[PDB]
């Protein structure tokens, strides 16, 4: 599977990286040249495997929904972790089952739940490889505020830069200095669903939107993407949430 070791990461090994999980998400259509991902998927191959190693060289193995790049749990030495949710558990029934226990954190994995949990909006938390690399090893040893926080610079960090090219690229930008994420980049994240979602509705409406997706630019500014021409389909997003999951 994906593996990061954040020991001599510089912006190109974190393009491999990010790249190499993108890769690893299966599709069988693309839309728009956008690949999409599967409706489902039975199985422990209904989750993907990244190996993430922090400068020290301790590592923790994280679990992806493959079919909305959804973190579930992870593994940290011989102990798991999922989420207080139904699919997080379910999750559970495929991988680090050779863990000597598992323990389940209070609190679901919505980044709104997290932001809760960690004490704050996830426009203050600092991202980019440094902060990475101390997520890794907060989640080492277990602390569920700490961790709340920790997972949502993960998310960002992988699942967030494999949706979109933007992101990816100001993870590039906090390669060495971590800098909270552009309003934008908040933007964007919550607009995955929306966007994946009416990008797959175009199809029929000659690339029209049927709803415009609201985001805010690199700078305040509130636009509306109305149509498939502009960029953040064109050169932006990278992996479509099947509409059979909205
Ligand atoms: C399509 O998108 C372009 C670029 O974003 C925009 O300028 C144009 O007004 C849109 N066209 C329609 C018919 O919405």
Same mark, same amino acid.
């Given at each position: 599977?994906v593996?990061?070791?954040?020991?001599?990461?510089?912006?190109?090994?974190?393009?491999?990286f990010?790249?190499?999980?993108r890769?690893?998400?299966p599709?069988?259509?693309?839309?728009?040249?956008?690949? %999409?991902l599967?409706? !489902?998927?039975?199985? @422990? /191959?209904?989750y $993907?495997?990244?190996?993430?190693?922090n400068y020290?060289?301790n590592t923790?193995?994280?679990?992806?929904?493959?079919?909305?790049?959804?973190?579930?749990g992870?593994l940290?030495?011989?102990?798991?972790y999922?989420?207080?949710?139904?699919?997080?558990?379910?999750?559970?029934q495929?991988?680090?089952?050779?863990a000597?226990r598992?323990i389940?954190l209070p609190?679901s994995?919505?980044?709104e739940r997290?932001q809760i949990?960690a004490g704050?909006?996830?426009?203050?938390?600092?991202?980019?490889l440094p902060?990475?690399?101390?997520?890794?090893?907060?989640? %080492?040893?277990?602390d !569920?505020?700490?961790? @709340? /926080?920790?997972? $949502?610079?993960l998310?960002?960090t992988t699942?967030?830069?494999?949706?979109?090219?933007?992101?990816?690229?100001?993870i590039?930008?906090?390669?060495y200095?971590?800098?909270?994420?552009?309003?934008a980049?908040?933007?964007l994240?919550?607009?995955?669903?929306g966007?994946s979602?009416?990008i797959?509705?175009?199809?029929?409406n000659?690339?029209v939107?049927?709803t415009?997706?609201?985001?805010?630019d690199?700078?305040?500014?509130?636009?509306?993407?109305?149509?498939?021409?502009s960029?953040?389909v064109?050169?932006?997003?990278?992996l479509?949430?099947?509409?059979?999951n909205?």
């Open positions: 599977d593996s990061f070791r954040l020991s001599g990461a510089d912006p190109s090994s974190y393009g491999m990010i790249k190499d999980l890769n690893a998400l599709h069988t259509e693309k839309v728009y040249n956008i690949p %999409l599967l409706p !489902s998927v039975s199985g @422990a /191959g209904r $993907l495997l990244m190996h993430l190693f020290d060289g923790i193995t994280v679990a992806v929904d493959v079919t909305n790049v959804y973190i579930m992870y940290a030495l011989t102990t798991s999922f989420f207080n949710e139904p699919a997080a558990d379910l999750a559970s495929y991988v680090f089952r050779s000597r598992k389940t609190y994995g919505n980044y997290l949990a704050k909006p996830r426009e203050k938390i600092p991202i980019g902060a990475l690399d101390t997520a890794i090893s907060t989640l %080492l040893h277990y !569920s505020t700490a961790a @709340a /926080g920790a997972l $949502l610079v998310i960002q699942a967030e830069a494999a949706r979109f090219k933007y992101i990816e690229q100001q590039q930008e906090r390669a200095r971590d800098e909270v994420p552009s309003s980049t908040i933007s994240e919550n607009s995955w669903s966007l979602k009416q797959q509705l175009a199809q029929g000659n690339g939107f049927r415009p997706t609201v985001l805010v690199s700078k305040g500014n509130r636009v509306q993407i109305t149509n498939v021409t960029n953040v064109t050169s932006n997003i990278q479509l949430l099947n509409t059979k909205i």
